[model samples]
Target: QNTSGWWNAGDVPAFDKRQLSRQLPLIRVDGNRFVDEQGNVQIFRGVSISDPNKLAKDQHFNKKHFDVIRSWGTNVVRIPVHPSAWRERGVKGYLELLDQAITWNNELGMYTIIDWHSMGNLKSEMFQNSMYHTSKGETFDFWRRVSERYNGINSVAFYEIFNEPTVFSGRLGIVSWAEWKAINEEAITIIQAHNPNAISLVAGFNWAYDLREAAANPIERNNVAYVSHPYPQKVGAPYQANWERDFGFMADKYPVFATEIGYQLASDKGAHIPVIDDGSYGPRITDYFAKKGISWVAWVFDPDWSPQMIKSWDYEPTMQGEHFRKVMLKENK
Candidate 1:
């Protein structure tokens, strides 16, 4: 290892106050791995902002919140902008938040992902009685506007095409896998036309869980990565089998970012159905990913939320958060 006192960690560590002297360059995909400008293979361990629809006004993006995350050894942050929020709040306000976030992350020396948070799986009554109901044309338009707004800002590391694309029938009607691929390809094209070097994250079908189809039919593009939300239930029995089928197969060719990984306890937030304790499911999945050198971001950094990373805004780690904190710290060491 090179003998730099503070920078000796095998991979990029979280931002410490003293290390903010120089800004790091944008991250790039190098055939199944992420690399900094100097070509150092880096793994991003971070937390995602809460769902936009559920995000409290007080919990909006700010420097303090990001500082707290940095203290936990996180090197990246995922900001999911809900489609409804764009329509309801207007582009000016949305762009303001996005710009501010990118600025803060740049100063803090962290990577940021701007996710077009579209959960098109669940049917909802709010937007014309459909949950995930954005038409292909509408999605293209939204991405075009967003890409134009954030072009040339390399600190904004990624443009996640969609949050969790699902195979559901909705206002847009039944969307097939082939159609999803076509839309994502077009989105990448539109995004790169302006932000040519920006890495695009394309999520898979079945609530972004299944990628078996993608392994056979991968997206034909440059500087692209696949995304998965691998919760314990989604991993299923024989975790290796499910993983290899849905996600792992893509590992050798393209980068796979588990953008949302969490283990929810039934005791926490009254979660009843898939009780993910620390002992078996959590360690198994996390360890598997760690061994494979996969990059991931834990879900939710808000208070009083299911699978919440921190106990409070004061930066105390919860059970799940503590587990990841220890993991991150050990990695840095």
Candidate 2:
């Protein structure tokens, strides 16, 4: 499928591997920002480890995959472990991959995040009826197991308790904000119970688009950061004002990580399925994040998925990828 053969080794810019080692600093929350081991402020620009099925088949979590990621100037990669796969693989198998991911990332001097890719509870009438129903006990156990395994891996910078949570008496079912917060807090408590030093990441309501409630009440813990998925489609009018109201306001009091951010035209046939893209949206968002000193991971790195960063194994950058590559790599400099 990759006819271009565009991403030759020589074409990929080289980075000083020596410089990579310093990115690790036991990343922790400091007031409203992330700080390194030395108490210095820090920001992460990275991509998600998406399309696990394809990744397992094509790249197979090989070292080369990380080399490419590092080449792109990304310092972190979020591994979204699908609950369905967890069901199939069992605990040992699931952890083995997490182990490998963290090890490989550490070897490359990059930061890694373990994400529970659960979309949240919904109604039984929903098409994927069982997808969002992973129980609280199960969720707690998952983090407990993860904490046990990676508690010592400081390069394991974050534990995103769950992904894009959304539901409020919708077709899936009702999941009030209060309930979601409780679930998230309990998951964080479980992780901290074992891995006391781990920085837990909690997503907000409305599919991680709104953090207003979180800013209002705040979670009862330290070293915990909030997660958001501010895609172009969800960023409402009076962009700066709305952003400040929902998320930016927290920047002065909490570490906010936009775990997923990007844009895609509606016609683009990809997984994330962005509503539309004016091209300008991508830069504007990145610029804002850069100025705010926020840490973020772009939506994806898979080649086949919509809103993906790469076009092939050759490492061709997609339109969105090219734009992000510039922003990510530029920021790295």
Candidate 3:
């Protein structure tokens, strides 16, 4: 899937989109590792931050929670930030909050994935399709601010260009490929121009399941990667089979960059739910990624958000999280 054009970072100190046209873009495939400076394989095991609904404004990355994550061999996080959260008094104050989050991760020596959590507006039911997510004039302005704020932060590895983006279908219900591409390109152009060297994670439409389509016909630009989110129950019984089938298909063309194996390991009644063969399966997915030399970040590390323990159960300070915690959180021993 080498598109004859790679992104090249010239001697210039700042990012140059034209020069980056030939670089073997860095992407997070399989949600476990990120590509190194040499374009080689590496791992980025860590937790994700949740609670977006609660802490909408004036939120800061919790350093203590990060301490727990680092103790578990987790070296990074997939953080979700709402565009609205960036605004203070109707003015975009995103960098202030964002810089603090990045600083926390850098101090811990962990990588961070800046994600635009909720989108699909202005033009749809989910998000407003405005400057926040779209490449409208302001969208570019927002990213430029972000780029300048963390321009030299090595701790921040990938700039999640966008989030679960879906265009409107007929009757203003869903989005067509053309629309999604149009909006996505807007954000992509802005992100690349500002942080040319930073890796960008792109989620496939249809909640990131349409990765194969993009892989078949990749974005014309370089420094972009693909992401996958597999929620087994939603996909039905033969979920894993279908995932491998589609993932294998995409890998044949473009590389499988980032995979988010979403799941729940506990019940609403604080009961331990049997790990669904593939329903709540996450570790098995990581094993596959490890074999392929891909990097990844789990959906989250917030105990309040997830009752399920994946790899840091023992350290979790809760009776319910501790009951089956031993079995839930597994380290890379």
Candidate 4:
């Protein structure tokens, strides 16, 4: 018996939660694709919800929030659990909110990705800003708790180890590829020890933009996918060439998930570098991802989050939002 005191004692893998009636099949990584229980290819097209903490305060953290996403023809949901939100409430306190999300998501026949949303170098203990500040130990502890809590639950499919990783060209400090890979490996090992079924995701350097390092030396683990946040202006026009050269090639060997991809007009609020775009970005990225059979979830659904999907609480679709709405309907449905 593994004797790790930090784990939840007497809790078993939540295999029983996936009853036949649910219809939400247990998804697993199958040879460069995410397949369900019956070997059917699953290309997840979905939208992201902002931090649960933020939603709860707004009183919209109920089932209706998830129900709207389900109505949009999304089969999967990406729940970004920010570190600041995690720290605001203690572990158990935060999980209480997550538990509710899991229940609602499973009930609605949708899968979830529990992303440990942070950005920076875990090896050097540097970060992008105060919002993403978190230590190496804390990150591992976070996963250890999450892995055991949602063990074997079919709905919680992808476990994103970190949201984004950047050194700002040695501005935040230096972290080599070997070091970065090792850090992700350690986190994956911890989660696997508790729940091997969990498919962990590893992001590359330069704010998760570059994955060329992965082509040379990929993460040495099974059921692990590489992540990218390929915004519009990250490269020039005809992005397919640079995309394949940068991160798309990893899909040939392993599952590649664009965990965060979105675009917005320069006129929209919160429009910034690498993410700014007019209406064209929506269809370009969508067509590219579908052609590659790459599973993707658009970034923040919250109004304030840049490149947002919704314009206001009415859930009115924004510019990119309306575009992705059609994407989910056409692809996922």
- Candidate 3 residue lDDT tens string, 184-251: 67677777676666666666665565666675556665656666665444355464467666553554
Total backbone clashes of candidate 4, pairs 3 or more residues apart or in separate chains: 0
What TM-score goes with each of the models? 0.84, 0.87, 0.70, 0.93
lDDT of 1 by residue, 109-141 (tens): 778888877776422211322334555555676
Stronger candidate by lDDT (2 vs 4): 4
Against the true structure, whose lDDT is highest? Answer: 4
Model 1 per-residue lDDT at 15: 24
**What pairs collide in candidate 4?**
none
Evaluate model 4: give its TM-score. Answer: 0.93
Off by over 4 Å in 3: 1-34, 51-61, 88-93, 121-139, 167-172, 252-259, 269-280, 306-333
- Residue 298, candidate 3: C-alpha displacement in angstroms: 1.8
Alpha carbon lDDT of residue 26, candidate 3?
A: 43
lDDT of 2 by residue, 27-84 (tens): 7787878887788888888899774544776755787887888888888888888766
Model 1, residue 262: displacement in angstroms?
0.6
Worst 10 residues of 3 by lDDT: 1-10
Judged by lDDT relative to the true structure, which candidate is superior, 2 or 3? 2
Residue pairs with backbone overlap in model 1:
120-132, 124-130, 124-131
TM-score of candidate 3 on Cα atoms, chains taken together:
0.70
In terms of lDDT, model 4 sits at 0.83
Q: Which one wins by lDDT: 1 or 3? A: 1
Better of 2 and 3 by TM-score: 2
